[PDB]
Ligand SMILES: [Cl-]
């Protein structure tokens with residue numbers, strides 16, 4: 001599912017991501033543009049051989065099992081495939097756990113490299129609040 005910007009925001013707001021561990025909704029919508037261009041199906045390979053899955057691009061080495069990543073911990077007890085669905089719930093439950101892992105949203109390199117230090121409100125400007 002390819003989301004619209006405000007469509008994603010409402011879905012992320014309904015799941016309570018807003019100020020979860022102190023990150024305004026804009027931080028999350030911004031993470032989801034640049035991680036995946038708003039697409040629940042995007043999958044990408046990392047060098048270390050791990051793959052990043054879905055809307056926020058949750059990684060298989062720690063976070064979900066894909067069966068091809070040595071040493072996977074499957075810290076969300078989940079199949080990485082289930083994070084590609086159109087029902088962002090599993091990706092949020094897991095994202096709540098990652099962000100809570102101490103380094104905050106810096107767990108997302110596109111958040112660090114592109115969202116952080118910016119006016120993350122442009123990402124919800126025009127969303128019906
Ligand atoms: Cl933090």
Ligand code: NA
Pocket residue numbers: 059060061062063064065066071072073074075
């Ligand atoms: Na894993």
